[PDB]
């Protein structure tokens, strides 16, 4: 049962993370790795929070990012949303 639920998340997890990682420009983004950290300034959270609503199709606070600060716990935070 929550074999299946993991692979669920863990594809979200790998799309978020590239939409991070494009945004910030690196070459990928680990799951862990603080916003802020990586230089993420209020143009890229904007940025990577209009690209991961048109992903999963639904509307996002910027809190989202803002509050979770990592690509695992936006990822949690939007998959809860979604369950």
Do not use: C, Q, Y
């Amino acid at each position: 049962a929550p074999r299946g639920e993991r692979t669920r998340r863990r594809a979200l997890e790998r799309d978020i993370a590239a939409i991070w990682a494009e945004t910030l420009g690196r070459d990928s983004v680990g799951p862990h790795e603080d916003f802020a950290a990586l230089g993420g300034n209020s143009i890229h959270a904007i940025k990577i929070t209009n690209r991961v609503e048109e992903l999963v199709d639904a509307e996002l606070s910027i809190r989202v990012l803002l509050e979770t600060r990592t690509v695992a716990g936006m990822t949690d935070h939007v998959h809860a949303t979604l369950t």
